[PDB]
Design a protein around this ligand. Structure first.
Ligand SMILES: [Zn+2]
Ligand SMILES: [Zn+2]
Ligand SMILES: [Zn+2]
Ligand SMILES: [Zn+2]
Ligand SMILES: [Zn+2]
Ligand SMILES: [Zn+2]
Ligand SMILES: [Zn+2]
Ligand SMILES: [Zn+2]
Ligand SMILES: [Zn+2]
Ligand SMILES: [Zn+2]
Ligand SMILES: [Zn+2]
Ligand SMILES: [Zn+2]
Ligand SMILES: [Zn+2]
Ligand SMILES: [Zn+2]
Ligand SMILES: [Zn+2]
Ligand SMILES: [Zn+2]
Ligand SMILES: [Zn+2]
Ligand SMILES: [Zn+2]
Ligand SMILES: [Zn+2]
Ligand SMILES: [Zn+2]
Ligand SMILES: [Zn+2]
Ligand SMILES: [Zn+2]
Ligand SMILES: [Zn+2]
Ligand SMILES: [Zn+2]
Ligand SMILES: [Zn+2]
Ligand SMILES: [Zn+2]
Ligand SMILES: [Zn+2]
Lengths: 172, 172, 172, 172, 172, 172
């Protein structure tokens, strides 16, 4: 038992390790999405930049959870980072829809982690999740919903004009 | 009778109280419109910002009339602020049409107030209305008419592309 | 169901709408109080400025809750904003006592909203209330209590000297 | 009953008074440790500076809890501040071990206070503890653990060279 | 015997330890007084600030004596810091009267310490006391006397107006 | 076939995808190493910072190869990123030895990729590898060798003093 460990349940430690993997996975999905939009036959530079930004953020989230694990005297155990479900993301709209679905999955995991912390009477962990993650997640989900709505209203994915203009006027 | 009161008719005092309520109502309508455009399934940020600006302006108008009432030795009596007629404003174009109709209603009230002031030989009140309100109202009505025209010509409300581009290029 | 909605109970959505109305009501009460102190037969300019500041803050609170409602995929429903209970607020002391009572009522509502969020296992909503509102409310209530105490000790409301000096030395 | 008091349980009020005493005690322990390292036959200036910093911080914590007690309408009751268990702290390593043990005791108290606040449905108090204290405490405990580890690995307490170099390279 | 110790009598060493405790006690009394004036039913912010300043100064005095003890090769022995005689300090005037009495008690102790140093032919200790403490103490006592006089002349403690205005015009 | 593709062999495209995976793996190994040194029972902050820097660099390498793949009209196919061989890295020295071995493995892969490019008469790819990667790799390997030598000469891993001082004087 770590000399620093206090009020830190085994289950919480395990759940933090799983959340580290999921954040890294989410980083990987966004990395794949980013370079899809970098292909010469897709060529939406600001969609590419947008997803690369999300990729780096998810990596930073994982790093912050790795720091938390050590702060509380838990031990980090890393797992393979699974390749994303798609190699080809179809269109700007489809990628935004996929991002939205991903972010709600990550959100569900965070909410389950918060519930566990509550159940184990770990107010430090509850506070960590609420402060660093919950509102960020809500904001990301709202932003992706907004983007999906605008793309649909503009006539995406069938209108390549719509995705081009959105890339310029919203993501640029 | 207030020690400051001079040449200030009872009817004028009453009409000022009614105009305070109407300006507050107009503030409320614009507040409702603003956050409609903030919904994830509408997602026109500059339409939202535009109407929030109008909301605050209408609130400032009411405050300035409350100051006038006290300046002249009248007594402010506040009434309930009625909820707007709609919860869902339909489209950018429809909201601009509704705004236009509202502003002409407020204008009619201001013009009736000015007529009353004229009828009661209250040149201070005539000057107050002419200086603070009449030209502002004419400008707002012209601007909203301009916006309605551009949205219609662009193909709104059926073209979600039209409302998107207008949001970016005129309201942004 | 909104594409963004997640872990957001119907009851929470409804309670947020009620809190929006109450914050707007509180804005209205403070607006009425402010211009009472602007009357020529009251003439306490810093009491007027103090309450106008509270009015605007309460309006900002409502706007922030309207943003939250949209962030979570809820739908804003606005209700009439009731006129305050008084047109004449009596004295600086009486207005401060009324403000204190109002702020504790708003606080009770916020605490009930937080309890609901807890009961519905909505840590994002718990965090929103705790972070934006609870400590602000506690501080406001403490400040109003302080002001009431000083006014009473100075000899208010019977001493117009007391309210004059307080206006200058505390609120100025 | 204080005019400001709301949702503030008697037990919470009492627990805050006890935490004020414990923070003051912790301040006192660190003050004693600091000047031990200031002795001519110990003479580790940065160990002295390190503990004096912790002493002042603990004093500030107590002051902030005294402010909270008044904010909520509780009444501060102060108790004697007990002298620390030791007059002679032995070595840098032993003092760091003692600091670590102290900080975990203070942490346990804070966690029990948070549990009480939760049990009494006092979200303002839960938020106060989580925001001002829990993460600070976790960070302090991690830092002290780090310091203990480095001192042990370097060969402390038997190596006066180890404590000298640590004083220079980590605490300086 | 410390390698640095020279011309430093056992009795002087003991008296320094007692003065350290008394300065810490005085710090504690002023801390209690400060937060009394922070209560919502007292609410004199500058009385609160004034006493908090005295609290910190007394703490600094103790720290400087702890440094002296080590400088001369004496050994610090800390004792419990007794809670102050009152939890409720009554009024601004009564607190200033209590402060005055406290400062004269601390002064008497300092003068007895100086007499001891003289009796033990310790000119370094005589100089330390004269330079760091005696004139500071005389100035504090004169200031508190001045404050008591002004509060009494203004009509304190019965005039809450007097204490309010003094808080603003002298302590602010 | 991509409209941009020219002189880009299928085998080269495949080898680039494998190198992307290996760079990401190397990023992951360094990430694991970094937070090992962040544990409270290891507590070498500059070893932690050093490996985190290498992690980010390897990620940037992968991103640059993903850009190259698109530049040449190849198609990125991502694979799982395998967890590192160790969860516990033992000591600073052992981690530096592991880093050295890893970097020579990555170097061997880069050299095989360069040989393939040469065999397929792809001077653009030869130039890309030589310019972005080969000299960087040689420098990293030399640096890690230097670090291993200094740690061994200082008495690592048995001397915790050696690893502490190296952390301060070389990595700090
Ligand atoms: Zn983030
Ligand atoms: Zn990073
Ligand atoms: Zn797999
Ligand atoms: Zn929390
Ligand atoms: Zn929080
Ligand atoms: Zn205007
Ligand atoms: Zn205003
Ligand atoms: Zn109605
Ligand atoms: Zn005119
Ligand atoms: Zn354009
Ligand atoms: Zn606020
Ligand atoms: Zn606003
Ligand atoms: Zn009504
Ligand atoms: Zn919370
Ligand atoms: Zn702190
Ligand atoms: Zn302080
Ligand atoms: Zn004792
Ligand atoms: Zn909380
Ligand atoms: Zn001093
Ligand atoms: Zn100090
Ligand atoms: Zn006692
Ligand atoms: Zn002398
Ligand atoms: Zn590089
Ligand atoms: Zn990058
Ligand atoms: Zn595997
Ligand atoms: Zn070449
Ligand atoms: Zn070259």
């Amino acid at each position: 038992t770590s000399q620093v460990r206090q009020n830190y349940h085994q289950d919480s430690e395990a759940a933090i390790n799983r959340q580290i993997n999921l954040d890294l996975y989410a980083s990987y999905v966004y990395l794949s999405m980013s370079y899809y939009f970098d292909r010469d036959d897709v060529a939406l530079k600001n969609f590419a930049k947008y997803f690369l930004h999300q990729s780096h953020e998810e990596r930073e989230h994982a790093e912050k959870l790795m720091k938390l694990q050590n702060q509380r005297g838990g031990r980090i155990f890393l797992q393979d980072i699974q390749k994303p479900d798609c190699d080809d993301w179809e269109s700007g709209l489809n990628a935004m829809e996929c991002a939205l679905h991903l972010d709600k999955n990550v959100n569900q995991s965070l909410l389950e982690l918060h519930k566990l912390a509550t159940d184990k009477n770990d107010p430090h962990l509850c506070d960590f999740i609420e402060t660093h993650y919950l509102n960020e997640q809500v904001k990301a989900i709202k932003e992706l919903g907004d983007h999906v709505t605008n793309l649909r209203k503009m006539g995406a994915p069938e209108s390549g004009l719509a995705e081009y203009l959105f890339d310029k006027h919203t993501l640029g």
